[PDB]
């Protein structure tokens, strides 16, 4: 009875980073270190906890946040980092204990002529708080004149898309990202390693 890692990591559709998805896995066995030795993952990095010795450590629940960004932004899914993905899309706390797993998805998330299905927030009036999720479509007022929900000068649609095409550099190619947040509550037990 162990948690569906197979179709969180191999899920066919991934979410856009502004509307990142979260799966809360509970009440199962888990084996993490057949995953720590990547071969498939270009990034597997951990914070507060360490990949070693963790099939022997436990928590009360597991949260799996999954989305897609461009390569040059995977360096932003870490505690204390800045940029428009960390500021306006997905923010990890400074006290983060968990991990970050990322792999290249160019062969399925790109398209010739551009895949415009993956979006990201590029305008917002203030940075996100840790694990906050904003899917507002409100017109962004970048000046003194109000917008009244219609786009114009200094009034912008806050989202924009990536347009992944297979001929891009790896820094602009689609990377699928899954973040695992571990639950320490003073309460019962849940998901553990073998």
């Amino acid at each position: 009875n162990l948690c569906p890692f197979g179709e969180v990591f191999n899920a066919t559709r991934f979410a856009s980073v502004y509307a990142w998805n979260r799966k809360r896995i509970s009440n199962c066995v888990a084996d993490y270190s057949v995953l720590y030795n990547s071969a498939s993952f270009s990034t597997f990095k951990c914070y507060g906890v360490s990949p070693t010795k963790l099939n022997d450590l436990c928590f009360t629940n597991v949260y799996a946040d999954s989305f897609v960004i461009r390569g040059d932004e995977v360096r932003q899914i870490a505690p204390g980092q800045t940029g428009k993905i960390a500021d306006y899309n997905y923010k990890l706390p400074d006290d983060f204990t968990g991990c970050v797993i990322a792999w290249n998805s160019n062969n399925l998330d790109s398209k010739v002529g551009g895949n415009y299905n993956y979006l990201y927030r590029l305008f917002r009036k203030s940075n996100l708080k840790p694990f906050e999720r904003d899917i507002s479509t409100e017109i962004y007022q970048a000046g003194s004149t109000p917008c009244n929900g219609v786009e114009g000068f200094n009034c912008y649609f806050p989202l924009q898309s990536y347009g992944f095409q297979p001929t891009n550099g790896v820094g602009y190619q689609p990377y699928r990202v899954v973040v695992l947040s571990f639950e320490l509550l003073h309460a019962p037990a849940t998901v553990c390693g073998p």
Partner: antibody
Amino acid sequence: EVQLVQSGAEVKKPGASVKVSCKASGYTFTGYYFHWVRQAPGQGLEWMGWINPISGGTKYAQKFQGWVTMTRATSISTVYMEVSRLRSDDTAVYYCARGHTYNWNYAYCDYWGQGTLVTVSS
Amino acid sequence: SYVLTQPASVSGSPGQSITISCTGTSSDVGVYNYVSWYQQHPGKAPKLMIYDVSNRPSGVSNRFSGSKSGNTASLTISGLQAEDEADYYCSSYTSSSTLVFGGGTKLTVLG
């Protein structure tokens, strides 16, 4: 190279409807707003409106508001200009052009479609 | 029918320089510098000749000059030749993020 390719000419009878297509290629389709501009034969250019490809938000000139609709499909990177219940006033060439950017910056049209002639007669 | 006021016909002889006026309101050519100038040869799509009042796209010959003063933009062609014969439209953005055009100017060259 940036390419805006429009549909072929259309001849229609009054009271019918027409949907001109304009497919973009060679650049990020969501990056720039699109302008629709009509020109009756022998006459000048008339701004019909603009559409934002990623939000679908539109703004029509007051002359064409209500009886014209602009739409887009980013799956195919195409914008559509549809006028229904034609009159013979509507015999004209219809142009799409790439306009300003997502943040309203490069406010001009450098790339135009070849033009679609729509001839409405009984 | 709000359009930028533009002379219907101008002309001039080869080697000389002509200028085409285009007069707007406070709300467009007066407040912003998003004026551009398109050239149309009969039967083809308009070609961007000048943008941002004075800037020429790549490939447009230096003979095409842009200028703006008050509410009146104007386009100057120096060393007029045969193939400059065409329709010329001014256009500009407005303070309500709308686009407007001019009436058009047919330019013929004498001789």
